[PDB]
Amino acid sequence: VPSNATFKNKEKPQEVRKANIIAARSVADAIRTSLGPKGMDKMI
Amino acid sequence: VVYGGGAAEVTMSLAVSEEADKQRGIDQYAFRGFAQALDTIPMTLAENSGLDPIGTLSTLKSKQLKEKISNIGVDCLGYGSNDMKELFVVDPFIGKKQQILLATQLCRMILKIDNVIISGK
Amino acid sequence: HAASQMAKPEKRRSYRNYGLDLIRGKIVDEIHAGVLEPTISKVKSLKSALEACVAILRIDTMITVDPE
Amino acid sequence: EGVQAFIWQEFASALEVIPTTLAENAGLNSIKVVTELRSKHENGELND
Amino acid sequence: NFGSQTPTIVVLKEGTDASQGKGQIISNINACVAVQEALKPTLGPLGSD
Ligand SMILES: Nc1ncnc2c1ncn2[C@@H]1O[C@H](COP(=O)(O)OP(=O)(O)O)[C@@H](O)[C@H]1O
């Protein structure tokens, strides 16, 4: 059950995908406050 | 005394999720977050052993519902016999009891933090 | 002004068109004092002053990009 | 009965962010609304 | 008379702030309200830290 089959290598892509999701959800949080009739305008 | 190998976290996880259905209310989602957090330790054991955390956790949860034996747990050595009684693995209960107390009481202070003032070095 | 809304019909009404006299420090009739202002000046001022406040109350987040 | 089915459980819960945001921006409690949303949308086919 | 400069005497030593005008006492109000802004969320058993 252990020690057999295969072992995962180069686990950085697992962290790269996490860094891409966290950075994308951070952008979606600022625009989330503008959703619906109760949303607010964003001055840039 | 308790038996280790992830058998303690799975037994205490289903007991909390069962109370969430009876209480309901606004705290119904609070017991769900605590039940999903206890299952992270058995799922972490399956990651280092190269197993499927989904298939391993589903087997442990289905075993506790069918039978009352709490001695079934994750095997990272893969000798078979998920029963902890045959594998002799034993952990102190005073050690496992502090793991929940130190984790729950620390998160209670962290969630109360609002303003963070950090001075420059 | 508070007694002008309750002044009630019957001119004897009065209670309206009164304002502050800053020189003498008294309340006198602005018609006899010779102070009048166009009505359209009040309509365009309140509508323009509101649009300035509405646009500000609707700004949740300000984003300032540095020049390149 | 598959790992693809377990992913679909998170796909349905991910769509709940839109009605949750409507309650947060309006000041109302999201769970109190969703609790009423799940009960009314069961019998009603739509427009709720 | 000892020099063509003839400096102008300043009443207070250099570095002293100013006052009076309008808003000097208002500056003290906004200083206390800003400190109050931190202590308001800490009120009540459901408050934060
Ligand atoms: N040989 C083993 N068989 C089954 N489970 C084990 C074994 N060794 C350790 N474990 C489990 O791994 C968890 C962590 O143990 P370990 O990392 O060795 O020390 P610590 O408990 O200080 O982290 C324990 O809760 C235990 O249940």
Side-chain angles (χ1 to χ4, degrees):
Chain A
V1 175
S3 296
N4 297 131
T6 187
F7 175 76
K8 294 177 179 178
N9 289 337
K10 59 179 67 180
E11 62 185 343
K12 184 185 292 179
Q14 294 177 336
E15 183 178 2
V16 175
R17 291 192 297 273
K18 293 176 179 177
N20 291 337
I21 293 170
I22 295 170
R25 295 176 64 185
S26 296
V27 177
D29 290 344
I31 189 169
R32 181 178 181 171
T33 59
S34 64
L35 179 64
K38 302 299 183 181
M40 295 177 183
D41 291 344
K42 302 299 183 180
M43 175 176 69
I44 295 170
Chain B
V1 290
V2 294
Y3 296 140
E9 295 84 357
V10 176
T11 300
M12 294 183 286
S13 178
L14 295 175
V16 176
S17 64
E18 183 178 2
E19 184 67 14
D21 290 344
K22 294 177 179 177
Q23 294 300 321
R24 294 182 182 175
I26 191 65
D27 290 344
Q28 186 174 356
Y29 295 93
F31 296 97
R32 293 182 181 175
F34 178 80
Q36 295 295 100
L38 295 175
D39 290 344
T40 59
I41 295 170
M43 292 175 70
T44 300
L45 297 175
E47 294 177 351
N48 290 337
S49 63
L51 294 177
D52 186 5
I54 295 170
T56 300
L57 178 63
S58 64
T59 300
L60 297 175
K61 292 166 62 181
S62 64
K63 180 62 174 172
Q64 296 300 321
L65 296 175
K66 183 178 179 180
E67 294 178 350
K68 294 177 179 177
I69 295 170
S70 64
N71 294 338
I72 304 300
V74 177
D75 291 346
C76 296
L77 296 175
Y79 296 140
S81 178
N82 290 336
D83 184 4
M84 293 296 103
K85 183 178 179 180
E86 294 178 351
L87 295 176
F88 297 97
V89 176
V90 175
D91 289 343
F93 175 80
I94 190 65
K96 301 299 183 181
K97 183 178 179 180
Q98 294 300 321
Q99 294 178 336
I100 295 171
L101 296 175
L102 293 175
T104 299
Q105 294 177 337
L106 178 63
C107 295
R108 181 179 63 195
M109 177 179 71
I110 295 170
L111 295 174
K112 294 177 179 177
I113 296 170
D114 187 5
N115 290 283
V116 175
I117 295 170
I118 295 171
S119 178
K121 294 177 179 177
Chain C
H1 298 290
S4 178
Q5 185 64 59
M6 294 178 182
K8 71 184 178 181
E10 62 185 343
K11 301 292 183 291
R12 69 180 292 274
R13 185 176 179 84
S14 178
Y15 296 140
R16 61 180 295 273
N17 291 338
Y18 295 140
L20 275 65
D21 185 4
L22 297 174
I23 295 170
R24 293 174 296 180
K26 294 177 179 177
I27 303 301
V28 296
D29 186 5
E30 296 302 321
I31 295 170
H32 300 290
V35 176
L36 295 174
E37 183 176 1
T39 299
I40 191 65
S41 178
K42 301 298 183 181
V43 176
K44 302 299 183 181
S45 296
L46 295 175
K47 293 177 179 177
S48 63
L50 178 63
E51 295 301 321
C53 183
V54 173
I56 295 171
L57 293 174
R58 291 176 61 84
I59 296 169
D60 181 67
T61 299
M62 176 179 71
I63 295 170
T64 299
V65 176
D66 290 344
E68 183 178 2
Chain D
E1 189 270 331
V3 296
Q4 185 173 355
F6 179 80
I7 296 170
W8 294 356
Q9 294 178 336
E10 296 301 321
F11 178 81
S13 64
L15 297 175
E16 294 178 350
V17 64
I18 303 301
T20 299
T21 300
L22 296 175
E24 295 302 321
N25 290 337
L28 296 175
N29 189 340
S30 64
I31 294 172
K32 293 177 179 177
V33 174
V34 174
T35 300
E36 294 177 350
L37 295 175
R38 180 182 294 177
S39 178
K40 293 177 179 178
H41 293 81
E42 183 67 14
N43 291 336
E45 69 281 4
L46 56 82
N47 289 336
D48 290 344
Chain E
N1 191 30
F2 294 160
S4 295
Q5 295 299 321
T6 305
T8 299
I9 296 171
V10 178
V11 176
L12 296 175
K13 184 178 179 180
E14 183 178 2
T16 301
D17 190 4
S19 178
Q20 292 90 3
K22 297 293 180 64
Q24 184 62 59
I25 187 168
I26 304 301
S27 296
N28 291 337
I29 295 171
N30 291 336
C32 296
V33 175
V35 176
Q36 185 175 355
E37 183 68 15
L39 275 66
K40 289 190 295 184
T42 59
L43 178 63
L46 275 67
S48 63
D49 291 344

